[PDB]
């Protein structure tokens, strides 16, 4: 999905192995905030949100807590106390088209900044001046969304990148999303300190 229309997936009750993704060189960016990226499988939270969108490379640095820019201010804002991870990978072979792609948009103007995890898809004509726009574009009256125009020949800083932000939400409810929690071999007839299921 486009960055302004970021998609949200809900994850309840399913074991996942974040080790096959962390060990993958395919992902150009794997940065976690509030939780160490190595120690991830042990953590347990009741629900998981997966926000997905597409940006350009120069904006991948904007997907982080306490950041500013077009994306952070007008498209997707992460809270300062965000506890989760941000993963991004180059999608030039998929989301770039010769002549420019017209399917991915981003919000260019907005009078106020987005709240954390806010989703704005309004297409109201941005009034930059004092004169009120009446639905017609013109001087100080611009459309709020703009197309990236991704091309395969673009610089890697301007090539398309697919970004997925995983957040782990714990509520006043049982924790239902758990990590792999691998095991080891067992030995008999010897004094051992053991840790079975619970």
């Amino acid at each position, epitope marked *: 999905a486009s960055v302004y229309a970021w998609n949200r997936k809900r994850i309840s009750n399913c074991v996942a192995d974040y080790s096959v993704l962390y060990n993958s060189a395919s992902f150009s960016t794997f940065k976690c905030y509030g939780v160490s990226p190595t120690k991830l499988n042990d953590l347990c939270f009741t629900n998981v949100y997966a926000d997905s969108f597409v940006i350009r490379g120069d904006e991948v640095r904007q997907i982080a807590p306490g950041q500013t820019g077009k994306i952070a201010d007008y498209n997707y804002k992460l809270p300062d106390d965000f506890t989760g991870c941000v993963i991004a990978w180059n999608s030039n072979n998929l989301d770039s088209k010769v002549g420019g792609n017209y399917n991915y948009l981003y919000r260019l103007f907005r009078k106020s900044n987005l709240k954390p995890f806010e989703r704005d898809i309004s297409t109201e004509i941005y009034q*930059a001046g004092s*004169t009120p726009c009446n639905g017609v574009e013109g001087f*100080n009256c611009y*459309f709020p969304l703009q197309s990236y125009g991704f091309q395969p020949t673009n610089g890697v800083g301007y090539q398309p990148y697919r970004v997925v932000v995983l957040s782990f939400e714990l509520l006043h409810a049982p924790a239902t999303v758990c990590g792999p929690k691998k095991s080891t071999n067992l030995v008999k007839n010897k004094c051992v300190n053991f840790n079975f299921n619970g």
Partner: antibody, heavy 123, light 109 residues
Framework: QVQLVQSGPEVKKPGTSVKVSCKAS????????VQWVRQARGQRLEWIGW????????NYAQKFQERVTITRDMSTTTAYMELSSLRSEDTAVYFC????????????????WGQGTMVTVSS | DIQMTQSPGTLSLSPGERATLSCRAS???????LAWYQQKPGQAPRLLIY???SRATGIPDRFSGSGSGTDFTLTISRLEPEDFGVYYC?????????FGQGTKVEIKR
């Protein structure tokens, strides 16, 4: 210091191209717009076209749709105007104009103007 | 395209009189999208009035503006020696944003 500085004088042969620069200062370029206007020596003002800095969308006049292309670069806060296939009729003074804007709103007219760039085209 | 016409061609007036300039559009244009500019020989245009009735920053209060639709007027209450130049009216609502042909205000003698 809300400034708008243009290129120096240009002297090009007929059939060539000229690229006039226009650099902004003081206000936030990223959310403004830049128009280009030409004036022949002792004549009236002839509007060439305008560009939205944030989006890059351009609108040209009928008489300049064929040989004028207006561009911008927010990184160097500079807008350019390329004029291809020059001729003696193009010998004039070119101005760029922009409304000064803060981070969220813009002025309701073109109050900032450049000093002007004289372009002479002859053999 | 919208055609902007200015009048008079030459305004010969004495310093201290009241100047009046006219601007006519070939079709009705928004009052909030009209501007007036002043240009002196060898100088860049200078914005005087916008939105037909909004004085710009630093422009003296002797400059005023009125009009609506196709006819607009620029009024100078008391003409100062620093005001003798060329005046243009431009509409910037409908593209192309055409200019007028200019009005030369000279010192009468």
């Amino acid at each position: 210091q809300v400034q708008l500085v243009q290129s120096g004088p240009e002297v090009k042969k007929p059939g060539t191209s000229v690229k006039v620069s226009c650099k902004a200062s003081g206000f936030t370029f990223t959310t403004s717009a830049v128009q280009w206007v030409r004036q022949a020596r002792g004549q009236r003002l002839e509007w060439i076209g305008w560009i939205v800095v944030g989006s890059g969308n351009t609108n040209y006049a009928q008489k300049f749709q064929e040989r004028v292309t207006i561009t911008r670069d927010m990184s160097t806060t500079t807008a350019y105007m390329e004029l291809s296939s020059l001729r003696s009729e193009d010998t004039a003074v070119y101005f760029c104009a922009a409304p000064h804007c803060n981070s969220t709103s813009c002025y309701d007219a073109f109050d900032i103007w450049g000093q002007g760039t004289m372009v002479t085209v002859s053999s | 395209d919208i055609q902007m016409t200015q009048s008079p061609g030459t305004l010969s007036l004495s310093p201290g009189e009241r100047a009046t300039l006219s601007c006519r559009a070939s079709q009705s244009v928004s009052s909030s999208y009209l501007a007036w500019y002043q240009q002196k020989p060898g100088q860049a245009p200078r914005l005087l009035i916008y939105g037909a009735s909004s004085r710009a920053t630093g422009i003296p209060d002797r400059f005023s503006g009125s009009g609506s639709g196709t006819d607009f007027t620029l009024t100078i209450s008391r003409l100062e020696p620093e005001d003798f130049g060329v005046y243009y009216c431009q509409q910037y609502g409908s593209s192309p944003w055409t200019f007028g042909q200019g009005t030369k205000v000279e010192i009468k003698r």
